Amino acid sequence: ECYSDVSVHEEMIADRVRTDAYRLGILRNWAALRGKTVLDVGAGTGILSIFCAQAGARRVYAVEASAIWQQAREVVRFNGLEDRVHVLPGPVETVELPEQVDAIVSEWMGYGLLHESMLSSVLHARTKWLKEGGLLLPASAELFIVPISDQMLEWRLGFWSQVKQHYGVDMSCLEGFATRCLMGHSEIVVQGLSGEDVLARPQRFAQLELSRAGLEQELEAGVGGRFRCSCYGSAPMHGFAIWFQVTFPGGEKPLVLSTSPFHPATHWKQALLYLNEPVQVEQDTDVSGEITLLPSPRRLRVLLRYKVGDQEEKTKDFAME
Amino acid sequence: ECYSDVSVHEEMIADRVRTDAYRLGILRNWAALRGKTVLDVGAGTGILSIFCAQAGARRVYAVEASAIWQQAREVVRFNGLEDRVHVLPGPVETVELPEQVDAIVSEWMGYGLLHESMLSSVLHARTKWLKEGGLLLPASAELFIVPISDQMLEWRLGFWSQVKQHYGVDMSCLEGFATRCLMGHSEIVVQGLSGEDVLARPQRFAQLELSRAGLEQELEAGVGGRFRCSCYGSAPMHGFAIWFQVTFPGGEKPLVLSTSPFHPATHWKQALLYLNEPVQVEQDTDVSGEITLLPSPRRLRVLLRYKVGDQEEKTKDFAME
Ligand SMILES: Nc1ncnc2c1ncn2[C@@H]1O[C@H](CSCC[C@H](N)C(=O)O)[C@@H](O)[C@H]1O
Ligand SMILES: Nc1ncnc2c1ncn2[C@@H]1O[C@H](CSCC[C@H](N)C(=O)O)[C@@H](O)[C@H]1O
Ligand SMILES: CN(C(=O)c1ccc(Br)s1)C(c1ccccc1)c1ccccc1
Numbered sequence A, B: 001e002c003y004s005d006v007s008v009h010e011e012m013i014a015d016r017v018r019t020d021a022y023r024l025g026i027l028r029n030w031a032a033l034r035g036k037t038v039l040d041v042g043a044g045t046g047i048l049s050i051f052c053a054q055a056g057a058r059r060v061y062a063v064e065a066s067a068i069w070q071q072a073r074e075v076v077r078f079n080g081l082e083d084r085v086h087v088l089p090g091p092v093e094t095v096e097l098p099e100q101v102d103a104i105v106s107e108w109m110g111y112g113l114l115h116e117s118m119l120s121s122v123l124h125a126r127t128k129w130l131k132e133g134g135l136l137l138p139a140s141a142e143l144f145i146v147p148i149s150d151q152m153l154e155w156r157l158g159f160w161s162q163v164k165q166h167y168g169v170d171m172s173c174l175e176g177f178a179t180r181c182l183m184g185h186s187e188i189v190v191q192g193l194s195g196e197d198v199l200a201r202p203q204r205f206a207q208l209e210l211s212r213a214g215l216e217q218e219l220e221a222g223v224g225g226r227f228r229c230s231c232y233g234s235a236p237m238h239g240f241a242i243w244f245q246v247t248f249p250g251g252e253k254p255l256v257l258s259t260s261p262f263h264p265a266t267h268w269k270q271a272l273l274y275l276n277e278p279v280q281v282e283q284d285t286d287v288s289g290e291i292t293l294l295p296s297p298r299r300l301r302v303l304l305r306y307k308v309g310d311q312e313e314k315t316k317d318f319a320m321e
């Protein structure tokens, strides 16, 4: 019953930005990887493991907990690489490796609990299996937030006004209802924005250096921080967008994979935090606040306290289950 | 927590083909409706009820079981029609009307159990509340089936062959897996096709005249029948598409709302039955079989026995839960 399995792995490989960034991030470290050993945490279909062999690794351990490992096994055998890449089924927390490894590669990033604890698995495997001063791909992640005006939401909120022009019945009185339903919930909406949706300069509110011990302990408290920015022009602000980038160390200068709305589109899109209703901003309107991401029913909470212009500080907390 | 509520009613009103067909189907019966009384079964946001008032009905009972009735109440009041259109919350099976009605309007059609038992509610309300020889909008429904080659599926099945040209790893060995996962399930896939996907002349396999008593009893056994057609040219046949049309009686000649892939696109799209793997057809290849739709865990079963060319008869049964 594996049509969900296929959709997910298809979507990732079809993301050229994601797939090339890993390819090149990995290849550009050929000097550190040639003749060395690698652990791919959550190998999926095995393509990251095989980039590691392309880059010259002598031995790669591709560990995959879920059913897709069979397919990873088939792809490695079919590419004549079973003597260099060993697909091991099961969680990385209990896999038995013969040796400590020179590098770890993982694609752990995304939005929700699956991804918070995929990163915990990557830290666990750093601690347990990676050599003092070993190579992490990617090595770091940064998080960004900015006020947004969402055109797709603007269009949906005004649709009820358009009905009169088209079917000669007035439904503009349902604008209030559409707003409550589309903005009044407490869910993270994962949606792709364009540059034109962005109302100020993006602000970095957190950096995670994966190399650091006590990052695990530091994530107990939950990642976040303060932000301040100034709007560019007149707009109905719908809320905030949040996205990440990760960094692969270079030979060269580092390679950055960004999920920003200014950069080309990825299957990750961006994570949207809607206020309960739109608020009109103008050129130089100050937008500040504080954002905390932390786990909790097992749920990832997003705590937001924010201030727009001369309006009062407000709290809106979000969740993903 | 009503963002699902909004998406559904938005999608329906945004369907011009659906909304105009009801508008015109209803208006073209102005002579039978003017000064008469109407029951709208599942009034939703009330737009069908208000088309009935536009067409000249003296009194319309808009019955809506779910939360959206508040919004129907707001839209009628705001259009100054509360003296002609009475929104009644609750199931139609237990609503108390003062009088028997001259006409019933409903949008009950779709794919799955919600829609099988929405039609049962429309038959229940015909029996209970509609006058001898009263008007039903729509009055009938017909079901069609044809062999299809799905381009979107063809593209997805070949994606794994394209990987070598792009990221220098061969994953063509996953074609078998993608096929099992995308075609080997037993689900109805609701997807929009184009004319070019269609491999023979569509065949009508059932007609439902809503006016007929014992239709309720006849639906116990389940609607379906035999079909036979001849393919147009060489193609990988992926399975069958099924769709409906409904008929509004005219003043004039009847109005037909079709969800065919040859007609303009609707939010209903078409219902797809994939074989477990593709089978190559050629010009004049005979495709015959038998299709039964019937209810059952409460699930709507689709029983298909079919024969392609000189291949043996096969059974594939599907479900929707
Ligand atoms: N603790 C764990 N140990 C091993 N695999 C894990 C894991 N937690 C999650 N996974 C697996 O990690 C994968 C995340 S998506 C994997 C992407 C992969 N690098 C690719 O190129 O396709 C899933 O296949 C999931 O089942
Ligand atoms: N037995 C029943 N009695 C009354 N309403 C019902 C019902 N079964 C389903 N419904 C309602 O029928 C609707 C189906 S969609 C309604 C479309 C509506 N004519 C429009 O123009 O928007 C839903 O709102 C559903 O809650
Ligand atoms: C897993 N994470 C998320 O689901 C979210 C990120 C943004 C939103 Br809004 S929710 C986070 C994350 C990781 C560890 C602990 C807490 C949060 C992440 C971090 C870096 C990069 C990507 C994600």
Ligand SMILES: CN(C(=O)c1ccc(Br)s1)C(c1ccccc1)c1ccccc1
Pocket: B109, B110, B111, B112, B113, B115, B116, B119, B141, B142, B143, B188, B219, B222, B223, B242, B244, B271, B293, B294, B295, B300, B302
């Ligand atoms: C509700 N129905 C469906 O879910 C399906 C139709 C096509 C597929 Br494949 S499943 C049917 C239907 C209605 C009553 C009894 C049995 C089936 C329908 C009929 C006419 C028009 C539309 C739908």
